[PDB]
Amino acid sequence: DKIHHHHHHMYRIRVFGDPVLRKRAKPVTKFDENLKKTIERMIETMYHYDGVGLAAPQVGISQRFFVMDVGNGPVAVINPEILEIDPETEVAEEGCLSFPEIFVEIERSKRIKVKYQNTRGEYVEEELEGYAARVFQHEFDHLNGVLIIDRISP
């Protein structure tokens, strides 16, 4: 291609094939200004690519955090844990900024109980369902090196 737009400040999104997407992310331990700035860049990047979720590995950082926006504004999730998963599930089509133009159908629990920290290290615990629950699981999967293609529904 003969013309290009160089982006700065926001992150470059890693594409399937980059092994950082398969490496199990490590937990965040430092809750400082840098983590905050990173979260801001994560949100900038997510919105810029029109995504609803973006996990650290997708920007080359194998740490356990991601951001997401399921319609209520951006939520920063650090060191998440999925405490409970409803046995009831639902299948829907899911894409991924790291897989340009690939969409597959994936079964996800309808409701989950999660626990995570905010940028100040404080814990938050909450119940999520429907779309919110789906996006959370999808982004959570990234932290364990799991991608949508590992979950195609039969």
UniProtKB/Swiss-Prot annotation:
Catalytic activity: N-terminal N-formyl-L-methionyl-[peptide] + H2O = N-terminal L-methionyl-[peptide] + formate
GO terms under biological process: co-translational protein modification; translation
Catalytic residue positions: E139
Cofactor(s) listed: Fe(2+)
Record key words, sorted: Hydrolase, Iron, Metal-binding, Protein biosynthesis
InterPro entries cross-referenced by the UniProt entry: Peptide_deformylase, Peptide_deformylase_sf
Domain of life assignment: Bacteria
CDD domains: Pep_deformylase
Binding residues annotated for Fe cation, in chain numbering: C96, H138, H142
Family to which the UniProt record says this protein belongs: Belongs to the polypeptide deformylase family.
Biological function: Removes the formyl group from the N-terminal Met of newly synthesized proteins. Requires at least a dipeptide for an efficient rate of reaction. N-terminal L-methionine is a prerequisite for activity but the enzyme has broad specificity at other positions.
Protein name: Peptide deformylase
Source organism: Thermotoga maritima (strain ATCC 43589 / DSM 3109 / JCM 10099 / NBRC 100826 / MSB8)
